[PDB]
Amino acid sequence: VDCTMYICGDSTECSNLLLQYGSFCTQLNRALTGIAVEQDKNTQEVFAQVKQIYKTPPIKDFGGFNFSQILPDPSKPSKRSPIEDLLFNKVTKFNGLTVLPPLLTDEMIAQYTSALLAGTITSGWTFGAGPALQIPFPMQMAYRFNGIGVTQNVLYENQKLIANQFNSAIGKIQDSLSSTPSALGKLQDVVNQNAQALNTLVKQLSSNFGAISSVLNDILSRLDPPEAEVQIDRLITGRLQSLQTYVTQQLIRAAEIRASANLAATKMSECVLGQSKRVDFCGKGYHLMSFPQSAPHGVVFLHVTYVPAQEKNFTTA
Amino acid sequence: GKIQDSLSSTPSALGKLQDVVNQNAQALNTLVKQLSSNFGAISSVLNDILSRLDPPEAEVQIDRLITGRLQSLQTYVTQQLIRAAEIRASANLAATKMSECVLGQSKRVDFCGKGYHLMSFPQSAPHGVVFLHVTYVPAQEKNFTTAPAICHDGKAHFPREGVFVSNGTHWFVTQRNFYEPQIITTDNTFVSGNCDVVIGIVNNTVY
Amino acid sequence: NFNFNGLTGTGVLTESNKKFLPFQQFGRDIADTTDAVRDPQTLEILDITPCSFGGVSVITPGTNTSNQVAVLYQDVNCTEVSNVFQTRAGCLIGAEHVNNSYECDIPIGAGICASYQTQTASQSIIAYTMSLGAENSVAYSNNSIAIPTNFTISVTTEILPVSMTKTS
Numbered sequence: 001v002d003c004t005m006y007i008c009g010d011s012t013e014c015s016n017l018l019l020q021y022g023s024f025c026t027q028l029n030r031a032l033t034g035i036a037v038e039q040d041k042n043t044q045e046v047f048a049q050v051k052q053i054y055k056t057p058p059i060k061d062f063g064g065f066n067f068s069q070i071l072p073d074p075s076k077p078s079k080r081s082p083i084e085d086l087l088f089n090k091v092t093k094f095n096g097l098t099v100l101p102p103l104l105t106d107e108m109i110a111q112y113t114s115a116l117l118a119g120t121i122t123s124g125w126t127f128g129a130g131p132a133l134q135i136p137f138p139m140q141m142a143y144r145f146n147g148i149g150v151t152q153n154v155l156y157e158n159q160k161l162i163a164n165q166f167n168s169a170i171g172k173i174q175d176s177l178s179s180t181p182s183a184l185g186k187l188q189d190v191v192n193q194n195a196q197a198l199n200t201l202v203k204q205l206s207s208n209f210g211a212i213s214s215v216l217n218d219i220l221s222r223l224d225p226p227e228a229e230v231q232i233d234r235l236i237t238g239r240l241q242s243l244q245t246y247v248t249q250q251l252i253r254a255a256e257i258r259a260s261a262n263l264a265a266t267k268m269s270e271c272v273l274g275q276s277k278r279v280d281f282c283g284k285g286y287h288l289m290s291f292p293q294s295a296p297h298g299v300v301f302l303h304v305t306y307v308p309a310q311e312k313n314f315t316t317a
Numbered sequence: 318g319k320i321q322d323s324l325s326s327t328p329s330a331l332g333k334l335q336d337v338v339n340q341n342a343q344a345l346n347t348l349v350k351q352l353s354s355n356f357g358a359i360s361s362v363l364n365d366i367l368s369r370l371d372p373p374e375a376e377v378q379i380d381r382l383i384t385g386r387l388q389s390l391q392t393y394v395t396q397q398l399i400r401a402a403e404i405r406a407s408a409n410l411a412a413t414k415m416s417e418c419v420l421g422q423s424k425r426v427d428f429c430g431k432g433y434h435l436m437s438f439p440q441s442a443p444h445g446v447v448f449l450h451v452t453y454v455p456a457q458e459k460n461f462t463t464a465p466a467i468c469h470d471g472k473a474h475f476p477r478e479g480v481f482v483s484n485g486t487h488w489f490v491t492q493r494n495f496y497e498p499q500i501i502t503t504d505n506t507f508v509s510g511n512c513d514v515v516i517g518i519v520n521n522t523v524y
Numbered sequence: 525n526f527n528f529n530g531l532t533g534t535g536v537l538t539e540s541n542k543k544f545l546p547f548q549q550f551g552r553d554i555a556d557t558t559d560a561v562r563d564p565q566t567l568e569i570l571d572i573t574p575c576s577f578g579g580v581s582v583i584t585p586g587t588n589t590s591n592q593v594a595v596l597y598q599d600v601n602c603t604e605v606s607n608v609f610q611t612r613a614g615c616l617i618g619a620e621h622v623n624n625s626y627e628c629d630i631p632i633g634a635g636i637c638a639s640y641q642t643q644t645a646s647q648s649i650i651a652y653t654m655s656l657g658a659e660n661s662v663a664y665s666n667n668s669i670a671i672p673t674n675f676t677i678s679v680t681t682e683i684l685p686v687s688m689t690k691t692s
């Protein structure tokens with residue numbers, strides 16, 4: 001935000017009166033800059049977790065699994081995976097209020113995400129902690145089961161069933177997200193709340209707060225100079241309060257978002273770049289794997305766990 | 318030794334605390350500098366107006382400045398209160414790492430830095446804590462032919478620990494974190510399933 | 525600087541792609557600010573665009589080794605602000621641009637970061653596409669695993685804030 005523009009730009013008298021409040025809005029211009037910087041830091045903490053960008057193999061040996069639904073599709077005009085596409089198509093001036101571009105764009109996020117996914121499928125934790133190791137998906141699966149104390153024979157006996165359960169669940173996720181848009185509320189609310197706070201700030205510029213006119217550059221051209229100064233001081237104060245209110249809310253929301261980003265970054269390490277046993281940490285059950293996906297303003301993880309299905313009562317000691 | 322050289326040659330490495338102290342000092346110094354703002358008054362100084370202006374005009378301008386000075390204090394407190402929430406979160410993380418990596422060796426993934434945590438050590442600092450995080454990271458690796466099991470007498474023999482490996486002539490058993498191959502014996506393997514189940518199963522005598 | 529039958533403000537007009545009702549001499553956007561106006565002597569709907577503005581930031585090497593700088597003017601043309609790089613992240617004046625991918629040094633925005641390579645050598649500011657590191661397209665096979673032999677003990681640092689100035 002350019003506070004000179006928001007309060008009253010292109011006016012000698014508005015500038016001279018705005019300056020009587022010192023750094024009151026200068027520090028807010030700084031607070032917003034700081035928030036924008038943090039937003040790129042949050043993005044880097046969550047997605048730039050590979051030593052170097054890694055790419056998937058030329059041969060998609062996924063053991064019967066469809067990871068084509070999670071990995072970005074390079075043949076499309078928008079390189080997004082089918083799940084990312086569903087989300088991206090659903091999660092959505094002269095007054096000095098503008099929005100700056102990200103440093104790390106959606107495509108580059110998708111590129112880090114692809115590297116993380118490539119590891120999730122064929123190298124596991126090694127794209128992170130040291131040189132990558134060659135750990136082909138079928139073996140990585142044998143290891144995902146051994147990691148929860150389950151003999152790898154379940155993988156081979158049920159190789160088709162295991163891939164089908166994964167693939168089926170992906171289809172269910174796609175069907176849910178495509179029909180229940182509120183499922184994306186975690187990001188939709190962020191964009192709507194920040195947009196509303198800012199749009200409200202714009203609407204509030206028209207409040208007069210008891211002033212003869214709600215517009216600072218109207219008063220200076222309408223009232224005798226000392227009368228104008230009084231009416232201008234009242235509106236500048238009201239406009240400054242609106243800027244401070246907005247920034248304070250954005251600073252608090254940034255704290256919540258930074259915390260969310262830190263949690264997201266933690267999940268990436270615990271379920272994407274490992275198979276953590278912290279109970280139900282990245283979803284209920286024992287972790288096997290997790291697949292990150294990009295999103296406007298966020299990250300999506302597909303949480304894969306081992307969950308008992310049928311059970312029986314046996315005599316014990 | 319590399320850490321000491323890094324910290325002394327790259328003082329920007331200390332930015333996690335240096336920026337915090339400078340930001341707080343600046344916020345407080347700003348609070349002082351803003352004492353000079355007049356907020357519509359003839360003068361920004363309350364004790365100047367009281368001995369300079371005709372008392373009823375002085376009263377009005379004094380109240381304007383009291384409000385202005387109050388707003389500066391309210392602003393400061395809110396900003397420090399929000400920053401305090403971030404600092405508390407940082408302190409909580411620091412406390413978490415000190416218990417989990419320093420008095421421990423947490424397996425949380427790359428939690429205290431990339432690699433498996435072997436150990437961690439805290440150092441004091443103005444306004445904060447410095448940690449030396451020590452991890453285990455593979456230096457070298459080699460590509461070996463592998464199998465989840467070997468086929469012997471129609472059954473699948475699984476390693477009790479590790480994966481079966483080969484250099485092209487003989488099969489052995491190794492761990493994922495270190496290529497120290499063992500002879501395949503009945504003391505190192507277990508039997509389950511069969512040769513028609515394991516994918517990647519290879520034919521190898523079990524002693 | 526506009527005044528159409530009492531409707532005032534500032535901006536740039538262009539032809540719109542929308543139609544208004546006979547009772548609608550102007551339109552407004554999401555926050556009820558002018559979207560477009562109609563010309564009372566030639567009715568036509570003309571979209572109003574805010575007059576070019578944006579923030580200005582400077583990309584600089586440290587002044588301890590060199591003083592070549594380039595300036596980014598956000599959301600504006602290179603002609604509104606010699607070696608000019610046009611981008612929505614802001615036109616970088618006093619810099620060149622290269623198509624090849626490199627690491628990030630000083631961010632411009634929207635996927636581009638400036639760096640300071642020399643040429644025949646003089647140092648200059650060149651805007652570059654971000655690479656995200658080497659593309660390690662590792663291939664895998666169900667019958668082969670990279671297994672660690674020896675290891676290194678890596679020690680790194682982390683510094684965390686614990687406390688603030690005890691303001692009283």
Ligand SMILES: *[C@@H]1O[C@H](CO)[C@@H](O[C@@H]2O[C@H](CO)[C@@H](O[C@@H]3O[C@H](CO)[C@@H](O)[C@H](O)[C@@H]3O)[C@H](O)[C@H]2NC(C)=O)[C@H](O)[C@H]1NC(C)=O
Pocket residue numbers: 564565566567
């Ligand atoms: C208000 O009155 C003015 C009178 O100047 C109107 O302008 C006139 O508009 C007519 C209709 O377009 C023009 O006649 C024709 O113009 C076309 C192209 O402009 C030309 O190819 C034809 O040969 C013919 O001259 C006329 O020139 C134009 N007069 C001007 C521009 O001076 C205007 O339309 C009226 N506006 C409203 C809202 O009623």
Ligand SMILES: *[C@@H]1O[C@H](CO)[C@@H](O[C@@H]2O[C@H](CO)[C@@H](O)[C@H](O)[C@H]2NC(C)=O)[C@H](O)[C@H]1NC(C)=O
Pocket residue numbers: 064065066068
């Ligand atoms: C992964 O999912 C894609 C998308 O559904 C599958 O592509 C379909 O393939 C079937 C037959 O193989 C075709 O009849 C469909 O027209 C394809 N769908 C689309 C949208 O093109 C693909 O087969 C799946 N891959 C695996 C290994 O299951």
Ligand SMILES: *[C@@H]1O[C@H](CO)[C@@H](O[C@@H]2O[C@H](CO)[C@@H](O)[C@H](O)[C@H]2NC(C)=O)[C@H](O)[C@H]1NC(C)=O
Pocket residue numbers: 161164165309310
């Ligand atoms: C465990 O549940 C799975 C569900 O995937 C069972 O697999 C199904 O088995 C039924 C009949 O046994 C078949 O009609 C289905 O076609 C199977 N599903 C798939 C995806 O193949 C499996 O039989 C169960 N296993 C045990 C040991 O009970």
Ligand SMILES: *[C@@H]1O[C@H](CO)[C@@H](O)[C@H](O)[C@H]1NC(C)=O
Pocket residue numbers: 311312313
């Ligand atoms: C095992 O016993 C519990 C306790 O009565 C009962 O609720 C459950 O149905 C039994 N489960 C099976 C598989 O018989």
Ligand SMILES: *[C@@H]1O[C@H](CO)[C@@H](O)[C@H](O)[C@H]1NC(C)=O
Pocket residue numbers: 468470471472512520
């Ligand atoms: C390994 O032994 C099995 C008997 O269980 C046999 O069917 C198979 O052909 C053998 N594989 C070889 C010789 O590669």
Ligand SMILES: *[C@@H]1O[C@H](CO)[C@@H](O)[C@H](O)[C@H]1NC(C)=O
Pocket residue numbers: 484485486487498
């Ligand atoms: C593979 O290793 C075994 C013992 O570890 C040895 O007998 C054999 O000569 C090795 N083969 C090659 C090709 O090095």
Ligand SMILES: *[C@@H]1O[C@H](CO)[C@@H](O)[C@H](O)[C@H]1NC(C)=O
Pocket residue numbers: 061516517665666667
């Ligand atoms: C590995 O998979 C490939 C195709 O993905 C197949 O041709 C080959 O037979 C498999 N090898 C083993 C040992 O299963």
Ligand SMILES: *[C@@H]1O[C@H](CO)[C@@H](O)[C@H](O)[C@H]1NC(C)=O
Pocket residue numbers: 598599600601611612
């Ligand atoms: C520069 O102007 C061109 C047309 O002259 C326009 O298409 C483009 O959007 C402008 N660039 C910026 C960053 O405003």
Ligand SMILES: *[C@@H]1O[C@H](CO)[C@@H](O)[C@H](O)[C@H]1NC(C)=O
Pocket residue numbers: 456457673674675676
């Ligand atoms: C690890 O082994 C490699 C050869 O594979 C050797 O070059 C290197 O010096 C060893 N590293 C250490 C730390 O001993």
